[PDB]
Amino acid sequence: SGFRKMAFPSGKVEGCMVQVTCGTTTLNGLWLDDVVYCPRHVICTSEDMLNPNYEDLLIRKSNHNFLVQAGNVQLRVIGHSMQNCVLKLKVDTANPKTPKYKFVRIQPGQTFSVLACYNGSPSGVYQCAMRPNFTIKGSFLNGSCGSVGFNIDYDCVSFCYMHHMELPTGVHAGTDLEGNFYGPFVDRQTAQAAGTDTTITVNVLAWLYAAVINGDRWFLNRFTTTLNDFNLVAMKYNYEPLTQDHVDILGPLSAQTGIAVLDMCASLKELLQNGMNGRTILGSALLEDEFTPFDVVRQCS
Amino acid sequence: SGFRKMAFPSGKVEGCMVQVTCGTTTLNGLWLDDVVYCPRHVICTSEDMLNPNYEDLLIRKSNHNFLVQAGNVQLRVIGHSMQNCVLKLKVDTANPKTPKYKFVRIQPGQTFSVLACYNGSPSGVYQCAMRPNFTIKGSFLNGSCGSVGFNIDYDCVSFCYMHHMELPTGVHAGTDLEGNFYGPFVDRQTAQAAGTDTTITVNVLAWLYAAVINGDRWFLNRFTTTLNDFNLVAMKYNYEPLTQDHVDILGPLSAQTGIAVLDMCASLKELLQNGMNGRTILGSALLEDEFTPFDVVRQC
Numbered sequence: 001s002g003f004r005k006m007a008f009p010s011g012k013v014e015g016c017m018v019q020v021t022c023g024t025t026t027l028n029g030l031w032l033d034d035v036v037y038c039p040r041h042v043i044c045t046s047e048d049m050l051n052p053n054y055e056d057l058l059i060r061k062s063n064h065n066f067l068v069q070a071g072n073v074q075l076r077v078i079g080h081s082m083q084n085c086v087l088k089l090k091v092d093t094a095n096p097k098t099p100k101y102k103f104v105r106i107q108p109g110q111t112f113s114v115l116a117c118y119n120g121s122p123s124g125v126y127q128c129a130m131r132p133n134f135t136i137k138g139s140f141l142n143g144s145c146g147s148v149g150f151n152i153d154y155d156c157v158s159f160c161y162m163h164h165m166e167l168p169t170g171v172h173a174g175t176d177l178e179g180n181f182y183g184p185f186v187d188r189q190t191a192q193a194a195g196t197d198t199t200i201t202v203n204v205l206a207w208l209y210a211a212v213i214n215g216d217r218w219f220l221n222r223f224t225t226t227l228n229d230f231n232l233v234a235m236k237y238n239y240e241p242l243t244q245d246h247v248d249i250l251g252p253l254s255a256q257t258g259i260a261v262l263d264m265c266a267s268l269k270e271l272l273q274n275g276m277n278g279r280t281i282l283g284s285a286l287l288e289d290e291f292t293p294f295d296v297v298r299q300c301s
Numbered sequence: 302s303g304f305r306k307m308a309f310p311s312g313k314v315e316g317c318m319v320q321v322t323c324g325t326t327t328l329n330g331l332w333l334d335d336v337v338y339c340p341r342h343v344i345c346t347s348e349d350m351l352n353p354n355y356e357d358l359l360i361r362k363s364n365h366n367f368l369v370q371a372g373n374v375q376l377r378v379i380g381h382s383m384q385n386c387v388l389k390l391k392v393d394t395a396n397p398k399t400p401k402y403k404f405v406r407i408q409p410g411q412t413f414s415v416l417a418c419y420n421g422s423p424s425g426v427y428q429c430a431m432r433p434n435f436t437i438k439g440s441f442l443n444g445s446c447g448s449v450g451f452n453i454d455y456d457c458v459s460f461c462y463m464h465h466m467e468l469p470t471g472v473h474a475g476t477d478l479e480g481n482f483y484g485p486f487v488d489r490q491t492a493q494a495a496g497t498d499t500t501i502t503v504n505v506l507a508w509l510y511a512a513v514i515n516g517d518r519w520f521l522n523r524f525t526t527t528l529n530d531f532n533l534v535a536m537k538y539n540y541e542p543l544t545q546d547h548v549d550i551l552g553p554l555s556a557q558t559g560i561a562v563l564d565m566c567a568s569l570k571e572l573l574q575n576g577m578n579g580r581t582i583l584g585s586a587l588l589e590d591e592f593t594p595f596d597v598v599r600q601c
């Protein structure tokens with residue numbers, strides 16, 4: 001029993017974190033087979049960061065301008081290329097710890113595990129959700145640029161996030177492993193505001209099912225509501241609209257629990273209109289929207 | 302910026318998780334050098350679990366009664382011994398992935414990372430605190446017995462918890478790595494109640510410092526309080542008394558923030574008396590007590 005923000009075992013990814021340096025600019029890189037992937041921003045000098053032209057800057061560099069350190073082992077760069085906002089450094093040694101991996105992009109609302117790294121050394125691991133506005137409320141300090149998010153399925157690591165920058169609000173923006181940003185952001189040292197965010201409704205409902213599975217039932221009621229009467233209130237509270245697909249993915253939890261999906265929605269209507277009144281659910285005084293149905297099914301029984 | 306429940310990189314520990322089976326009983330073990338440590342409960346059959354005498358059960362066993370699997374590699378048991386509630390199985394192959402490690406016990410109120418393991422395969426990692434009543438509000442399912450909590454300091458893994466069982470309330474109990482239980486519990490399949498818990502005050506204060514370090518200051522006030530009037534208001538909110546150690550440990554945070562420790566105490570008193578009023582701190586609507594001063598300094 002119990003329910004926590006659980007991340008995937010980070011060992012397989014620790015085996016790939018390295019340090020990439022160009023001039024005095026330095027950040028984290030990901031070593032897979034004989035390629036090191038890192039944010040292209042590393043090729044920028046302090047004065048280039050404001051308004052860079054990455055093609056123009058990359059032409060002016062050579063393979064020996066790129067210092068790649070894996071622990072104390074200096075890898076030799078033998079090739080370089082740009083793939084959107086990510087730089088690919090071909091090196092003479094294939095990472096022997098290279099796991100089975102895939103480069104997959106994730107949907108807003110999907111969760112993933114973040115391995116916070118600095119100078120090539122992992123320092124922490126935690127769970128994040130892709131916000132509907134394509135940012136993530138992460139935990140990053142200066143020097144985390146280049147850390148990766150990932151998921152693991154049957155021994156295969158699907159890397160989905162490369163960290164790039166922190167926005168004014170304190171949330172974080174980044175790319176997938178092909179260098180395509182999540183959301184309307186560019187790798188440029190300029191003020192870029194995060195869009196208006198929303199609450200991931202399917203996630204809240206899955207977390208409520210986890211609560212019932214774990215003994216918290218005070219939020220339950222006998223009421224019911226239509227999928228449309230609930231959508232009207234959710235919109236009032238800046239919640240994402242609930243489709244009938246979202247209902248289908250919630251099916252298994254409705255079965256194991258025996259609480260109709262619409263009944264949970266009526267309880268959520270209830271919770272959004274009366275608050276909580278000094279009560280808690282799974283130890284939280286807010287409605288948590290960063291647990292997917294997959295997360296619940298995995299950690300719960 | 303940002304603040305989350307961050308665990309330590311679990312790779313060094315994933316390299317040591319193995320599976321231990323005795324009869325039909327099976328659980329997780331920790332393989333370091335040529336020793337595999339696991340809950341001694343594994344020597345129990347279904348019928349011994351209720352009221353065991355582990356000395357009698359252990360004398361009746363031999364080395365070839367212990368099947369140890371690391372992947373598809375069967376490790377061979379060459380010796381066995383009991384270390385309080387921990388079983389030690391000496392095997393003929395030393396773990397090549399053995400990191401620099403230590404066996405350390407933790408005080409109530411300290412945190413650590415948990416690697417949830419099943420049949421020898423790790424499945425997740427998360428942060429936990431040793432509660433004041435010597436339980437942990439963890440996340441464990443059947444088969445997690447033998448998973449370990451741990452801390453990492455400069456490549457050195459301080460193993461501090463071996464998971465043993467789940468109590469009626471949903472809390473979890475276990476031992477240190479020498480087999481000495483945390484709190485008033487025994488490795489016996491019987492109803493065992495968790496004690497009355499209290500909220501970790503020094504930790505709450507550290508989390509509020511983290512909020513200040515991250516820009517949220519609405520909870521601050523100009524009032525001040527003595528260590529004694531604040532301890533009185535806390536004890537009524539089921540908060541732990543704040544010692545002068547707990548005050549000194551917060552010094553660095555008070556300094557980098559410029560908020561007197563007693564000034565937090567006045568703000569925490571106000572928060573405990575008026576609640577939060579639909580407001581939040583670091584994304585939480587309640588007072589978090591599972592971040593230590595060290596955790597905050599590490600993340601901030």
Ligand SMILES: Cc1cncc(-n2c(=O)[nH]/c(=N\c3cc4cn(C)nc4cc3Cl)n(Cc3cc(Cl)c(F)cc3Oc3ccc(C#N)c(F)c3)c2=O)c1
Nearest residue numbers: 026041140142143145164165166167187188189191192302
């Ligand atoms: C707290 C925190 C959390 N996460 C990441 C960070 N972080 C960092 O750690 N480094 C960091 N630049 C560096 C400074 C270095 C100095 N040396 C010696 N080496 C260095 C290497 C790097 Cl990369 N930048 C800014 C930044 C990164 C990228 Cl990739 C980008 F393309 C544009 C950037 O400029 C901005 C500036 C403002 C906004 C806005 N609004 C924006 F969107 C982008 C950042 O934000 C910081």
Ligand SMILES: Cc1cncc(-n2c(=O)[nH]/c(=N\c3cc4cn(C)nc4cc3Cl)n(Cc3cc(Cl)c(F)cc3Oc3ccc(C#N)c(F)c3)c2=O)c1
Nearest residue numbers: 001326327342441442443444465466467468488489490493
């Ligand atoms: C959900 C969950 C989370 N965490 C751990 C668990 N968990 C488990 O996974 N296994 C588990 N027994 C096993 C069953 C097995 C069947 N096979 C084939 N092999 C097995 C190996 C084990 Cl170990 N036991 C009970 C348990 C463990 C230990 Cl060590 C102990 F010393 C006393 C125990 O009995 C109790 C029973 C009740 C209370 C109370 N109140 C108590 F204090 C102790 C448990 O609680 C379950």
